[PDB]
Every structure is written in structure tokens, then in C-alpha cells.
Amino acid sequence: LRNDFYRQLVGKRILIVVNYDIDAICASRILQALFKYDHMLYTVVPIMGVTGLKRAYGEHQGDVKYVVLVNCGGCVDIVELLQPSDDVTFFICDSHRPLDVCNIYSDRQVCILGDASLEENIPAFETIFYDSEGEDEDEDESSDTEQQHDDSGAGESDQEDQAPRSRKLSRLERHEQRILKQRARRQWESERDRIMFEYTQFSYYGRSAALMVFELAWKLSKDNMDLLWWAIVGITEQLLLGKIESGAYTLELEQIQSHVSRLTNKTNDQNTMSASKITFENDLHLVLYRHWPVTESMRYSRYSSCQLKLWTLRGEKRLHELLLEMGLPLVHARQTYGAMDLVLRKEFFSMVERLAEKYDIADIVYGTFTLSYGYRSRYAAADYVYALLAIMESVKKHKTPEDCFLEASDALSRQHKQLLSAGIDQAKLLHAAVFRQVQSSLEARQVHSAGSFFYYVLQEEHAFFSYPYALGLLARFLLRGHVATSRARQASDLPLIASCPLNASEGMCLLVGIVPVREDSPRNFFGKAFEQAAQKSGVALLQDFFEPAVVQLRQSDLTRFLDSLTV
Amino acid sequence: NQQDAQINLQAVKKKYKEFIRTFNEENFFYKYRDTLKRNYLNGRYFLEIEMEDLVGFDETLADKLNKQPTEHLEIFEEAAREVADEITAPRPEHEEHMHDIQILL
């Protein structure tokens, strides 16, 4: 809580705007407003990894006491990181769930926004940072160390019955004096059945970046309805169960309903031009449903493509034969929905909810929003994150990537929209350059069993996919095709690998991988799994990214690495 | 006057002229309106429009005008020579004579 600490927020600070994300700029660009509200001058930062972290703060070495932590924290006992932390406060609103308690405890310059269903790490700092064996933090027979040292009385301290602390078992003797180590490893390790089961099994994330910030500012008599749309960007970034597990998807159908079915600054005069009060609507999260013809969707939909095999023609025979039950035209089924005749686009959605009942794809419809600025338009709630990431363009001019991070922050203004359609120049063509090796894949059958998973690697770059995140998508695009449709469950469901050719960046074998179908809540051991081969051997490995699921090799230090990675 | 449907006046009655005055938003530049005023920089005697403001205004007229379009456009001629000729003078000191224009969709 900071209803009290926000009262403190006057003196100098840094609002770093945390590592690569949608949600950051959503949950920060709000705050360039609030700072000019309370008359605060500011400074904000691009982060791509721990590289950026001190390479810049080493340039900003003050004692600036009010400091942020979002999308970060699972990196260092960050006093170990920022040793110039003496009393310089940090601020926690991070979504990275698995973090170390060393930054929770020693709670000098950190603030716990803590409420959760995990009472499993209670003394984990009281032993882990407290114990050791073959330990020197003790007295000795020598007359030099017969003084009050940091007598931790622990697995740090003596094993000759000179130690105040360690009331856990007997100190005179259990069966001998030296059984202290035995119980120390027992107590150390027997919980590492759970502790090292934490942080060495998988990784996943928490919650929002500005939902609290809405509620923080909800008290401030602030009906900045615009900011709600800024908010939902971060919501449907990863509340979407199509990407990341929410559950609260179906339980904030109450809350934000309880927000905005409640919150109505105009019950009487809301039907006019600028930013009419919003709606919730039961809609899709379909592949860019609105602005281009159906025949873009009916191919480019994974939820169609998962169940129907549409890269080939039987899908299309299945397609149109299901358009029998609608009896849609075809010319109209190849122009933009918004451009079609009108009773069709109007009437269209109403029947699809019901006459998708029988054709294996019933779960295309979800809950969403929709609103505008004026009368040029009706932008769409879900139709916004995807044009953004066309500006996350992996140009190697050395100027674009940092600077285009700034353009994003200039993007979500009402004033700045000419740029915005440029994404749509870029986005769709990506989305159908998607197939550009897929049907070359499913028929080449470039899926590799590779033991206890499924496995793929690409060996030729895309200027598109130099940029990293689509690597996950293509991985998420195909195993449905052959691996999930021509098989039984025993021979189908296993996770996958997805390599990234850096045909330009000197050769370093970038990669991501993902779980099998219908195993989502089974969080990915890939949170650690790639440490398997690396922990054993490791060869020039990197974890320079903030992300867990992310790596970087050499051109040729991947196969024997992968051979170690068999397990 | 046949005031049931297919009404012979609606457009010039109030509607399209005033929608055009509804083509009127902040920045004080959202206009299909002073377009002709910059045509009167030379007297080009024409104007441009869309077919996707009426969609941004309604869903009622777009399936309607398609029936009788070449009627609507001289209805619009009438609209103009009634509208801008209001704008030829604020208060009673300007009009030599009216004229005619064209519209571009």
C-alpha cells in the first residue's frame, strides 16, 4: 500500500520504465501525467536486460532515494546488485512472481505489496543465508579468534560447542559433537525438496502493472475513462487465456463489470463525440476479427487451424460447407467486414455463437470492450496490441530499437494515430508470412521427436523474425497441424522447441520452446529445463535477458548441448 | 409532400446539409465544409467527399442512397446553392449571383 507512501512522493526519484513489454508503457505513460500533476520532473529508461541496468545507473550514480521495481526483482539480492543502496528506497509493483526473499527480507529499501496463497517459504532466509558446513565463522583452538565475532551460531559457526545460536537440536552431542553438520544438511536440504523445487523447476508471472494504479488513483476522483483503455492493453496482453493463464478472466467479468457497470460519470449525457463511456461486449479474441475479410481469419486462426487443418484444402471444403449454414456470399467473404454490406456485418456475429456449436470450435467467443474517439472510426478493444509490435522492429541501424521503444510511448495518445495504422501495414503481412515455411514444414515433417519432447530448429533467418517473439508463435502455430493431428494422445502431447536463425548477427543460435496442447497450467519446466544441459556442462550460455524462457548459444555449441539436454 | 417514406425532401429538408454541419469537430479543422471555401480561392466549383462518414454517422442511408444516387447528387447541388449562398454573405451585403458545382466521391 502507498496511500501513505505516495504522500512521500515529492523529492527526486527515477521512474525507470521497466523491461521490454506492452504492460510497462501502459502502466507508466499514465505516470508521466501524475508527476506533472504534483509538479515532479522525471526521468525514464529503456530496459532490455540486466545490461541496461547498471551500465546506465553507473552514469546516474546519485543517492536518488525513490526507486522503482516492476517487471524485475528476480535477478539479484539487489543490494548485492546496487551496493550504492544505503537507504535509497525501492518500489515493488512487479509481475515476476518467482522472486528471492533476500530482497523481501533485509527489508531496508523495499516494500512488500504482499497477499498470496503461499505459506511455504517462511524461514527460508533463516536457514539458507544462515547455514553452511565446513565453516569458519567460529572460534578456534588458536588464541586469535577467542572473541565475539559474527557468531552466527549456525552452520556458519563452530562445531565444538561454542555457539549461542542453533537451538534447533542438541549442541553438546546428538550422538557426537560433529552431528551438527548432519542435521544442518538435513534441515538445509530436506526443505529444499520444496525450496530448490522453487526457482529450479519452472517460472511464471503474477499480475498487472497498473490495475492497482487504477485503484490507487480510483480514490483521487479520477474518471479518466481514457486510462481504462490504456489499462486493458495490459489486461488482454496476458489476461488472455489464449496466451497466458488468467482464470480471473472469468472472475473479472464481475470486477471490471463491478467497475464499469457501476462506474458511470454520465448516466444521462453520454451519447456524443469524444470518448463516449465504454462498453463491455461478449466478442472474440479471434485473429483480428474486424477490419479485413473473413478469408483472412479463416486461415490465420489457430483456433480454426487447430481443429480443422486449413493450410490444406479439406479445411476450405469444410469451411464453405459450414458457410452453407450461414449461406454467406463469397465476394463479400473476400472484402473487409467493415466494408461489406451492412445487415450482414451487423447480423453476422449473432449466429456464429450458436452455429459454431457442432463444428469443434465453440470457444472463439470471449468478453471484451469497444470504443472510439469520434466518427472517423470505431477502434476495437482487442484490435490494438498487435499493431504495436510492428514498431518493435528488429532493425540493425543501432538506432531503431531504443528509439522505437519511445515511439510506442508516443503511440497510445489520442493525438498520435497516423503512425498507428503503419502497424497494420506491417502486422497482417507478418501473420500470413507465418505460413511461409509452415506448409513447407508440415509436409517436410521437420518436427523432430528428439526423445522426451518434440523438437524443431530453423536454420535460415527472416528479417521479420530477427525480432524474437514470433519465434514462440510459429512454435505455437504448427504442432497442432501434424503433431496433434495425425496421432493419438499418447503419441501427440509433448512440449516443443523453436530455434531462431541469426543469419545476420554472427551466429548464436537463439531459441524458445513451449508446452503441448491442452497442457497450459502445467507451467513450463523450460523455466529451468534448458539449464539441464547448461548446468551440467554449459558452453558460452547467456541468461542476459530478464525473461526466464530465453537463451543464446554459439553457432555450433547446441547439439552436444542438446545431447546433454536429452532428459 | 409525401411524408411516409421515400420522402422527397428529407435531404434538403434538413438532413444532409446539417450532417455536413455535423461534420464539425474540434481542432476547428474537422470539415468537409470549408473545402469549397478553398475552392473559392479559385472558383473550382466542386468538392470531395467519402462514402465512409455516412457509415461513421449511421447505417441507414448507405443502403438508401444507392437506390437513387444521381438524384441525391443534384439534391446536393441544391444543398450547396442553398448553403454556400447563405455563406456568400453574413449580413445583407454580398451576393452577385449563384452558380453550380460538382461533387466527388
Q: What do you get for the CA distance between the two ends of chain A, in Å? A: 44
Choose among B53, B57, B59: nearest Cβ to A346: B59
**Grid coordinates in use for A52?**
541496461
> What nine digits make up the cell of A244?
497466458
Question: With contact defined as beta carbons under 8 Å apart, do A442 and A435 qualify?
Answer: no
- Residue A441 CA to residue A456 CA, distance in Å, equals 10
Q: Which stretches of A104-162 are DSSP H helices? A: 124-128
Beta strand A66-69 pairing with A89-92: parallel
Q: Which residues on neighbouring strands pair with residue A497, listed in sequence order? A: A513
| Alpha carbon separation from B64 to A74, B57, B72 (Å, rounded) | 62, 14, 10
Q: How far apart are CA A173 and CA A300, in angstroms?
A: 71
Q: Helix (H, G, I), strand (E, B), or coil: what is residue A552?
A: coil
Among A20, A16, A94, residue whose Cα is nearest residue A468: A20
The grid cell for A372 is 472510439
Burial category of A232 from C-beta neighbours within 10 Å (exposed 0-12, middle 13-18, buried 19 and up): buried
Residue closest to A380 by CA, chosen among A303, A263, A281: A281
For residues A248 and A256, what is the distance between their CA atoms, to the nearest angstrom?
11
Contact of A97 with A204, CB cutoff 8 Å: yes
* Cα torsion through A71, A74, A75, A80, rounded to 10: 110
Cell of A477: 502455430
Q: Is B55 left (phi over 0), alpha (psi -120 to 50) or beta?
A: alpha
Torsion of CA A212, A217, A223, A229, to 10 degrees: -30
E strands of chain B, at which residues? Answer: none
Give the span between the Cα atoms of A147 and A139, in whole angstroms. 7
* Distance between CA atoms of residues A412 and A234, nearest Å: 12
Q: Which helix (H) or strand (E) holds A90?
A: strand A89-92
Do A72 and A548 contact (CB within 8 A), yes or no? no
* Letter string b/e over residues A530-560, b meaning 16 or more CB atoms within 10 A of that residue's CB: bbbbbeeeeeebebebbbbbbbbbeeebbee
CB contact under 8 A, A376 and B62: no
Q: How many CB pairs under 8 A join A and B?
A: 18
* Distance, CA of A234 to CA of A238 (rounded, Å): 7
Are the CB atoms for A66 and A43 separated by under 8 Å?
no
Please give the single-letter amino acid code of residue B78.
E
Q: Environment class of residue A521 by beta-carbon count within 10 Å: exposed (0-12), middle (13-18) or buried (19+)?
A: exposed
Q: Kindly report the number of other CB atoms within 10 A of residue A245's CB atom.
A: 15
Using a CB-CB cut-off of 8 Å, the residues of chain B touching A291 are: none
Cβ contact, residue pair A342, B53, below 8 Å: no
Is the CB of A346 inside 8 Å of chain B's CB atoms? Answer: yes
Cβ separation of B57 and A375 shorter than 8 Å? yes
d(CA A557, CA A539): 7
Which residues in A353-363 are b (16+ Cβ under 10 Å) and which e?
eeebeeeebee
**Is residue B27 within 8 Å of B81, Cβ to Cβ?**
no
Among residues A309, A504, A303, A305, the alpha carbon closest in space to that of A397 is found at: A504
Closest partner CB to B56 (pick from A274, A342, A375): A375
- B67 — contact with chain A (CB < 8 Å)? no
CA distance A549 to A558: 16
**Residues contacting residue A341 through CB under 8 Å, at least 6 positions apart:** A332, B63
Measured between alpha carbons, how far is A132 from A188 in angstroms, rounded to an integer? 9
Look up residue A335 and give its three cell numbers. Answer: 472484402
Helix (H), strand (E), coil (C) string for A516-543: CCCCCCCCCHHHCCCHHHHHHCCCCCCC
Please state, in angstroms and rounded to a whole number, the distance separating the CA atoms of residues B63 and B67: 8
Do residue A342 and residue B62 have CB atoms under 8 angstroms apart? yes
Q: What is the resolution of this structure in A?
A: 4.3
Cell output for A379:
477502434
Q: How many CA atoms lie within 13 A of A221 on its CB side?
A: 0
- The dihedral region occupied by A120, where left means phi > 0, alpha psi between -120 and 50, and beta the remainder, is alpha
Sequence-distant (6+) residues with CB within 8 A of B81 are B98, B99, B100, B101
Q: Is B26 in contact with A274 (Cβ distance < 8 A)?
A: yes
